[PDB]
Amino acid sequence: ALLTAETFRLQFNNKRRLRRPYYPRKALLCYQLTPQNGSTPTRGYFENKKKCHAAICFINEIKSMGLDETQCYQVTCYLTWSPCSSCASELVDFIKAHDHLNLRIFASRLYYHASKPQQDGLRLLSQEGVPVEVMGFPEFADCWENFVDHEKPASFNPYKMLEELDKNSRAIKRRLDRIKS
Ligand SMILES: [Zn+2]
């Protein structure tokens, strides 16, 4: 299952939105499990469901895969919104449980307004060794390359989109760095 170009552009657009998002907080998560021995990487994505938030559905997917724990793995997660406090705590517990699994978290946007629970969740994830980094051009390009359907042409120019995303990420990186300590 692959995303469309328009869905990718709408979800990962990091140009600071003006009109507040309405409930529920729609959040996309694309993940890539890469086996370190070289076998086929597994890719997927999850949205916010009333059943589970994207991070929780991702954690449950990794748990249900039943990984060969004699191997080592690299996991990369591209999120549209950075995780909330509860998802951050669940991710910290998931990181601690799996010492054969090196996790990297990237986020397109952090949040519309700053909050103590979300900032403390991000600080907890940072102290555990998996800080929520901001997506730049390499991360947007990798997520575009591997998760979008390219059999059919896009309705827009992808290079201008990647340029706009990279341009907007520069200030969001400063917003993230002002907090991290
Ligand atoms: Zn959440």
Author numbering: 2 to 182
Question: Which sentences did the original study use to describe this structure?
Answer:
A3H is the most polymorphic member of the APOBEC family, as its mRNA can undergo alternative splicing to generate four splicing variants (SVs), and has seven distinct human A3H haplotypes (hap I-VII) containing various combinations of five single nucleotide polymorphisms. Literature suggests that the anti-HIV activity of A3H can be through both deaminase dependent and independent manners, and the different anti-HIV activities of the A3H variants were attributed to a combination of different factors, such as differences in RNA binding and virion packaging, protein stability, deaminase activity, and subcellular localization. Evidence so far suggests that binding to RNA is largely responsible for the multimerization of A3H and some other APOBEC members. RNase A treatment is required to activate or enhance the deamination on ssDNA for A3H and several APOBEC members, which suggests overlapping binding sites for both RNA and ssDNA substrates.
While A3H m1 carries a set of 7 mutations and produced a stable dimer form, stable monomeric forms can be isolated from both A3H m1+H114A and m1+W115A/C116S mutants. With these stable dimeric and monomeric forms of the A3H WT and mutants in hand, we performed crystallization trials either with the MBP tag or the cleaved forms, with or without nucleic acids, and obtained a high-quality crystal form of the cleaved A3H m1+W115A/C116S monomer that diffracted to 2.49 Å resolution. The A3H m1+W115A/C116S monomeric structure was determined to 2.49Å resolution and refined to excellent statistics. Each asymmetric unit (asu) contains two A3H molecules that have nearly identical structure for the core fold and the loops. Notably, helix 6 (h6) of A3H extended six amino acid residues (1.7 turns) at its N-terminal side, making it the longest h6 among all APOBECs. The canonical short beta strand 5 (β5) of APOBEC proteins is not a typical strand in this A3H monomeric structure. The disruption of β5 appears to result from the proline residue (P132) that forms an outward-facing bulge and moves away from β4, disrupting the already short β5, which may reflect an alternative conformation of β5 in A3H natural state. In addition to β5 strand, the A3H monomer contains a long loop 1 around the Zn-center. The monomeric structure also shows that A3H is highly positively charged on one end around the Zn-active center, and more or less neutral and negatively charged on the other end. In addition, stable monomeric A3H can be obtained simply by mutating H114 or W115/C116 (as mutants A3H m1+H114A and m1+W115A/C116S), suggesting that H114 and W115 participate in nucleic acid binding and their interactions with RNA are critical for dimer formation.
